[model samples]
Target chain A: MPVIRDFQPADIETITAIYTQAVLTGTGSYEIEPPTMDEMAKRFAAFADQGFPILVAEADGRVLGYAYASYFRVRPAYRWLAEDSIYIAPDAKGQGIGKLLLRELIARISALGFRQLLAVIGDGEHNIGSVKLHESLGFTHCGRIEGSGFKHGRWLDTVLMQLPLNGGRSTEPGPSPLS
Target chain B: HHMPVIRDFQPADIETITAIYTQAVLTGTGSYEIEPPTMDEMAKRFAAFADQGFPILVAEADGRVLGYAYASYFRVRPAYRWLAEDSIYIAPDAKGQGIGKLLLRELIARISALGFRQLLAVIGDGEHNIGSVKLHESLGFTHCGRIEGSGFKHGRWLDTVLMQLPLNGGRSTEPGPSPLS
Candidate 1:
C-alpha cells in the first residue's frame, strides 16, 4: 500500500518526469512543452508556499504520483474557489494510483475552507479516464466550451466540472478564507 | 444625476477606482474578495491590464467617478487571446443609475476595437444578480450558461452567470489580427 506524504525537495525530479509524460501523451493538462526541473521547481514551490497541500504517493521509497490545489482565478472574489491537478507516473497506471491521489486531494481541499473545486479538463473526447475519475469522486458535468483548446494537430474541447466542498454555499463563508 | 460621460482611465483615477472596489468587496458579492486590496495593489493590477493593451474605461459626472469597466484575457494561455473577460464595478453611491450599462457598452466598443472576438462576463451571485443579467442582455450579450455554487461569500453560495458577446468575426472565420499585437 502506498502512503501519501507532503512533498520533499527530492520529489521534484520524479514529479517533473510524471508531468512531462502527462503533457506529451495526456489531456489532463494543456501544456505543449514540459517544464524542466528548475521551472517545475518554481511551480510546485508556489503551491507548497501558498499553504496549499502538495501531496505525493510513496511506496517502497519511490514517489509514484502527486496532486495539489491552486486558485481558480486571479481575482479576489474568486478566492473561495480552487482548481486541482493530478499526475501519475506513466508506469503507475491501472493500479488505482490516480484514484487514490484524487480521493485524498478532495478530502484535503475540503478542509482548507474552499467552497468550490473546478476541473478544467482538456481533450474531453479522449480523456475518459480523467473524466471518469472526477465523476467517481463527486464532480458533476457543468459545461463544455467547444474547440477552446488546440493541441496535437486538432482542436480540442475543454470540459468543466464542479464539486462543492465543505459547507459550499449553503453556509456563509465566515471571516476571510484566504486571509 | 445626468448620464455619466464615458472616458479612458487616467493615472489619477486609480485612487477613486480603489475606493469603489473596496466598498464593493466589503458590502456585496459583486467581488468575492473578503478583504479589499490596498490602493497600491489595485494599481498594480490596473497597470497590468493597461500594459496588455486592454481597455480600462471610467464613467465620470460632475468630476466624480461613477463606475469603471475593463477587459482582460479570458485565460493566460497564448491561444486564448481572442477571448476576453469583462469586469464592471459600480460605486455604491452610483448603483441603479445606469452607470453599469454606460460603462459596459463603452468597454465593449473599446475592447472590440482592440480586436478581441469574444467578451465574457463571469457575473458573480447569478441568482440575485438580476441587474447584471438584465444589463448584459440589454447590451446584446447571450447567456452562455451558469455554474452553480461556484463561489462562497457573504454567507452564501453564489452562482456564476456566464454571458458572452460575439464580436468582429466571432469564430466565423480565422482570427484577423492578433489582439496582442
Candidate 2:
C-alpha cells in the first residue's frame, strides 16, 4: 500500500522527472520544448512561495506520482478558483494512483476556500482513461475547439472543460482577470 | 479605413457605451445575454485593456467617447503569444454614422503594432453584422470559418464568425518571453 502525502523540497528531481515524461511523450497542453532544471527550480520556488501544495504518493518510501494546483485567474474575485495539473509516474499506472493523487489535490484545494476548479486535459480523444477519470470525478465539458491549432502538420483540438466548485454563480460574473 | 480616428476611452463614455451593449445583449440579437454588465463591470474590463497596452479606441467627437472598441484576450496561457480576439461596440445613438467603422480601423493598427499576428472577430451568426463585416473587409480581414450554434443568449442559439487579419504581415518563428511567469 502507498501513502499520499505533501511533497518535500527534496522531491523536486523525481517530481519533475514524471512531468517531463508526460509533457514530452504525451499530447498535453504544451508542445514546445520541455522545461530545464533551472526552469523547474524557479517554478518550484514560485509554487512554494504561494503556498501551492505539491502532493506525492509513495510506497516503501519511493515516489509514485504527484499533483499540484495553481492560480486559474489572478483576479481577487477568482481567488476561490484554481486550475489543477497532475502527473503519474509510469510504473505507478493502472493502480488508481492518479485518482488518489487528484482526490487529494481536490480536497486540499477545496479546504483552501476555492469554489471553482478548471482541469484542462490535452489528450481527451485518444486518451479515454484521462477522460473517464475526469467525468467520474464530476467534471463537465464546458467547451471545445475543433482543429484549433497546427502541430507537426496535424490539427489538435483542445477540450476546455469546467468543474464548478462555487455554490452560486450570481456572485461570479463578467470579464475574467489575467491568468 | 483610412479616415477613422484613434482615441482613448474616458470616464464619461461609460453610460452611453454600455447602454449600446446592454440593448444588443438584451434584445437577443447579440451573442451576450440579457442582463448587461454593470458600469463597474465594464470599467474593470477597460482598466485591463489600458494596463496591458491593448488599445481601447472610442470613435470620438470633440473628445467624447461616442463608440468603443477594444481587444479581447485570446488565451490565458503564455504559449498562444501572437493572437488577439477583437470586440467592437457601437452606441445605439452613434450606430450607422460609421462609428464602428472608425473604431475598427484604429483597433487594427493599434493591435498589430503590439506583436499580435492574428486577430479574430467573433461575429454572431444568422444576424449578419454588415457594418462589422464591411469594416473588417475594408481593413483586410478575411472570413476564415464559422461555427454553428456555438453559444446561447437571450434564448437563441448564437454562431461564432471567425475573421482573420494577418498583422505580423510576415512570419513569426521565435517564441518571445512569457509576459507572466
Candidate 3:
C-alpha cells in the first residue's frame, strides 16, 4: 500500500524526475520542454507559499506519484476555485497511485475552504486516461477549447473539468483575503 | 449620429480607461474586483498586453473614449499561447449606443490577424448580463460553458459565462509561432 503524505524538500529531486518524464513522454502536460530542477523548485515553493496542498504517494520508501492544487486563475474573483495537477512515475503506472494522490489532494484542498476544483486536462481526446480519472473522481466536463495548444508538432485541445468542493457554488464563500 | 471610430489604444486614453473600469468594479458585476486599481496599476496592465504584442483598442468620437477592448493570454503558459481572452468596458453613460459591439468586432479582427486561433469571453455575472451575452453571440461566439456562482461580489454570487470564437479556421488548420514570440 502506498502512503500519501506531504511533500518534503528531499522529495523534490525524485518528483522532478517523474515530472520531466511526464512532460516529455505523455500528453498529460502540454509543455514541450521539461523544466529544470531550479524552475521546478520555484514552482513547488510558489504553491507552498500560497498555503495550497502538495502531496506525494510513497511506497517501499520510493515516491510513486505527486499531486498539488493551485489557483485556477490569478484574478481575485477566482480565489474560491482551485486547479489540480497530478503526475505518476512511468514505472508506477496502473498502480492506482494517481487516485491515492488525488483523493488526498482533494481532501486537503476542501479543508482549506476552496469552493470548486478544476482540472485542465491537455489533449482533449488523446488523453483519455486523465479524463476518465477525473470522471471517476466526480469531476464533470465543463468545457472544451479546441486547438488551444500546439505541442509535439500537432495541435491539441484542452479539456476543462470541474468538481465542487465545500458546498461549491451552492452557498456563499467565506471572507477571502484575495478580494 | 457619428459612428464611434475604433482605433489603437493610446497612452492618453489610460486616464479615461481607468475611470471606465473603476465604475465597472464598483457598480457593476462585469469585473470581479472590489477595490479598483490605481492609475499606475491600470497602466501596468495595459503595458503588459501591449508589450506582449496583444491587441488593445478604443472607440472614440466627439473627442471622448466611449469604451476600450483588449485581448490577453487566456493562460500564461507556453501551450496556451494561441488562445486569447478578451475584455471590453464601456463608460456607464455610453451603454446602449452599440459601442461595445463595434469595439469587440475590431478586437476580433485584430487578434485574428495576429495568428491567434481562439478568442474567449469570460463574462462575469453571466446570468443577468444579457447585453454582453447577446453581443458575443451576434459576433459568432457560441456558448462554451457556465460556472454558476463562480464569484461573490456586491453581496451576491455571480456566475461566469464562457463564450468562444474560433479564428482563422480554429482547430481546422495548423498553427505557427504565437504572437507573443
Candidate 4:
C-alpha cells in the first residue's frame, strides 16, 4: 500500500524524472522542454517557502506520484483561489496513485482555508483521464479556452475546472493565508 | 472637441496611465486591486510587456492621454503564447465618450496583426459592469463564462466575467510562431 506524505528534498530527483516524461509525452503541462534538477529544485523551494502543500505517494520507499497546490493567479485579489497540479511516474500509471495524492492534497489545502481549487487541464478533449479524475473528485467545469496552445503538431485546448472549498462563496472569507 | 488618436504608449504617458488606474482602483470595480501600484511599479509592468513585443497603446487628445490599452500573455507559459488578454483603462472624465471602445478596437487590430489567435477580456465585477460588457460585445466578443466570487472588493464578493474574441480565424486554423517567442 502506498502512503501519501509531504515532499522531501530526496524526492526531487524522482519528481523531475516524472515531470520530464509528462512534458515530453503528455499534455498535462504545456512546457516543451523539461527543466533540469536545479530548476525543479527552485520550483519546489518556492512552493515550500510559501507554506503551500506538496504531497507524494510513496510505497516501499519508492515514489509513485506527486500533487501540489499553487496560486491560481499571482494577484492579491486572487488569494482565495489555488490551482492544482499532479503527475505520476510513467510506469506508475493506471494505479490509484493519482487519487491518493490528490485526495491528500485537497485535505491539506482545505485546512489552509482556501476558498477554491482550480484545475487547468491541458490538451482539453484529449485528456479524458485527467478530466474524469477531477470530475470524480467533485470538480465542475468552469470554462474552456479553445486552441489556446499549439503543441505536438496540433492545436490544444485548455479546460478549466473548479472545486469550491471552505464554504466557497457562501460566507465571507477570513484573513488571507499570506497575512 | 478634439478626437482621441490611438498611438503607441510612451514613457511620458506613465504618470497619466498610473493616475487613471489609481482612480479606477479607488472608485470602481473595474480593477480588483485594493491598492494602486506606484508609477515605478506601473513602468516596470509596462516595460515587461513592451520588452516581450506586446502592444500597448494610449488614446491621445489635446496633448494628453485620455485612455490606455494593452495586450499581454493570458498566461505566462510557453504553450499559451498565442493567447492574449487585454487590459484597458480610461480616464474618469473621459468616460461615456466611447474612448474605451476606440482604444480596444485599435488594440484588437494591433494584437491580431501580431499573429495572436485569441483575445480575452477578464472583466472584473462582471455583473454590474454593463458598459464594459457592452463595449466588448460591440466588438464581436462573446461572453464565454463567469467565475463567481472570484474577488472581494468594496465589502462584497465580485465576479469575473470572461469574454473572448477569436482573431485570425481563432481555433479554426493552426497558429504560427508566437510573437513573444
Candidate 5:
C-alpha cells in the first residue's frame, strides 16, 4: 500500500525524477524539456510557500508518485480556485497509485479552504487514464480547448475538469487576503 | 465628441490603461479581479508584451484613452506559440458606445497579421456579461466552452465564458511561422 503524506524537502529530487519521466515518454504534460534540478526546486518551494498542499506516495521508503495544487490563475478573484498536477513513476504504472495520490490530494486541498480544483488534462484524446481517474472521483468535463498544445511532433488538445471544494458556494468565503 | 481612434500603445499610455482597468475590476464582474494591480506591475506587463512582439492597442479620443486591448500567450510554452489570448478593457464612463467592438476588431486584424492562428477570449461572468459576449459574437467569435463557477468574486461564484475566433487559416492549414518569430 502507498502511504500518502505531506511532502518533505528531501522528496524534491525523487519528485523531479517522476516528472522527468512524464515529460519524456508521455503526453500528460506538455513540457518538451526536462527541468533542471534548481528549476524543479524553485517550483516546489513556491507552492509550499503559498500554503498550497503537496503530497507524496511512498511505500517502504521509496517514492512512487506525487501531487500538488497551485493557483489556477494569477487574478485576485481566482484565489479560491486551484489546479492539480499529479505524476507517478514509470515503473509504478497500473497499480492504482494515481488514484491514491489524487484522492488524498483532493481531501487536503479542500481542507485548505479552496472552493474549486481543476485538472487541465493534456492530450485529451489519448490521456484517458487521467480522464477516467478524474471522472471516477466526481470531477466533471467542463471544457476542452482544441489544439491547445503541440509537443513531440503533434498537436494536443486539453480537457478541463472541475471539482467544487468544501461547500462550493453554499456559504460565503471569509475575507481573503487576496482581496 | 471625436471618434475613438485605434492605435498602438506608447509608454505614456500605461497610466491611462491602468486606471481604466482598475475601475473595471472594482465596479463589475466583467473582469473577475478583486484588487487591481499596481501601476508598476502594469508597466512591467506592458514591457513584457512589447518584448514578446505582441500588440497593445488603445482606443483614444482627443488624447484620452477610452479603452484598450492586447494579446498575450494563451499558454507560454513553445507548443502554444501559435495561439494568443486577448484582453480588453473599456472605461466605465465610456460604456455603451461600442468601443469594445472597435478595440476587438482592430486587435483581431493586428494579431492575425502577426501570424497568429487563433485568438481566444476568456470572458468572465458568463451569461450575465452580455456586453462582452455580444461584442465577441459580432466579431466572428464562436462559443467554445464554459468553466462553471470557476471564480469567486464579490460574494458569488462567477463562470468563465470561453470564446474562440479563427485568424487567417486558423486550424484549416499548417501554421506559417511561430508568433514569437
Candidate 6:
C-alpha cells in the first residue's frame, strides 16, 4: 500500500519532474515553457515561505505524486481562500494517487482557519480525469468559461469547481471530519 | 485632521512605503504576510512599477500615511499590454470611510488618462462589505466571475470576484495605439 506524507528535500527531483511534465503536456499551468531548475528551486523556497505542505504519496520508498496549496494572491482580505494544485507522476496515473492527495489537502486547510477555498482549474474540457476527480470529492460545478486558456495551439475551456471546508458558511475553525 | 500629504509614490518614498505596508500586514485585510517587506523587497516592487509605469497613489493626511492604491500588470503577455489591474488599500483603522472610494475614483481617472483600455479589480466573493462591492459597480465595473477558493491564507480558501472596467467605454474595437507596446 502506498502512503502519503509530508515532502522531504530529497524528493525535490521527483516533484520537479512531475511539475515540469504537467505544464508541458497538460494545460494545468499557463507558463509558455517548463521552469528551469533554478526557477524551480525558487518555487520550493516559496513553498517553505508560505508554510504550505508539499505532500508526497510514497510506495516502497518511491514517490508516486504530490499535492499542496498556495495563495492565489497576496492580499489580506483574500485570506480564508487558497488555490490548491495537484501533480501526479506520469507513470502513476489511474492508481488513486491524485484523489488521495486532494482529499488530504482539503483536510489540511480545514485545520488552518480558512473560511473558503477555490480551485482555479484548467479550462480544458477534454480533461475528464481532472473533472471527475474534482467531482468525486464533492466539488460542485460553479461555471464554465469558454476559451479561457490557450495551450497546445488551441483554446481551452476552463471550469470552476468549489468545495466548502466549513460545513455551513464560515462557521468552523478546525478541519471538518474526513468525509 | 490630516498631516501626511498622501500622494502617488515617488522613487524616493521607499521607507514610508515599507512602514505603511508593514502596518497593513501586521493588522488588517490589506496584506497577508506576517512580517512587512524589508527595504530590499520594497525596492524590487518599486522597480517593477517603474518598469510598467503603473500608478501608486496614496492618501497621506499627515506626514503619516493612511492609505494607498495602484494599478498593476493584469496580464503578462503582449496582448494584455493595454490592460491593468487596480489595487486599493486604506489603513485598517481608516476603512469604511469614503477614502477607498475616493482613491479608486482617482485611480480610474489616472489609468484612463494613460489610455489603458482594460482595468480589472479583484474583490472578495460573498462580500458582506456592500460598500466594497458597490464601489466598483457604481464606478461602472461589472463582476466577471468568482474563482471560489482561488487562494489560501490565514488557513482557508479565499474566493476572488473579478470586476472589470473597459476604459474605452466598452466600444466594439479600437485601433491599437502605436501598433505595439
**What is the descending TM-score order?**
4, 3, 5, 1, 6, 2
lDDT of 5 by residue, A90-113 (tens): 888789998999999998887777
Better of 2 and 6 by lDDT: 6
Q: Rank the candidates by lDDT, best first.
A: 4, 3, 5, 1, 6, 2
Off by over 4 Å in 6: A58-62, A74-80, A111-115, A124-128, A141-160, A166-169, A172-179, B1-48, B57-68, B73-83, B89-118, B124-126, B146-160, B166-181
lDDT of 2 by residue, B51-100 (tens): 87677777766655566788866664333445577888776766777777
lDDT of 3 by residue, A1-179 (tens): 88999999889899989989988887778777889888999999999998888899999999998999998766677788889999889899887888878888999988888888889888978988788889989999888777778877778878889898888877768866233
State candidate 5's TM-score: 0.94
> Cα RMSD to native, each candidate?
3.1, 8.1, 1.5, 1.2, 1.9, 6.4
Tell me how each candidate scores on DockQ against the true complex. 0.37, 0.07, 0.64, 0.69, 0.59, 0.14
Model 1: what TM-score for its first chain? 0.95
lDDT of 6 at A146: 41
Candidate 4, DockQ score (0 to 1):
0.69
lDDT of 2 at A84: 80
- Where is the poorest 10-residue window by lDDT in model 5 chain A? A170-179
Taken over the whole model, the C-alpha lDDT of each candidate is 0.81, 0.64, 0.87, 0.88, 0.85, 0.67
Clashing pairs in 5: none
Interface RMSD of each: 2.8, 8.5, 1.6, 1.2, 1.6, 6.0
What's the TM-score, to 2 decimals, of chain B in model 5?
A: 0.97
- DockQ versus reference, model 2: 0.07
lDDT (tens digit, per residue) of candidate 1 on B13-66? 999999999988888886767889999999999999999888999999999988
Report the lDDT tens digits of candidate 5 across residue range B19-61: 9988988878878778788899999999999999999999999
| Candidate 3 docking band | medium
Backbone clash total, candidate 2:
2
Candidate 1's fnat? 0.35
lDDT of 6 by residue, A53-128 (tens): 6688999888898888876555444455566778888899998989998988888877775545566667447777
Native contact fraction (fnat) of model 5? 0.58
Output the number of the TM-score-best candidate: 4
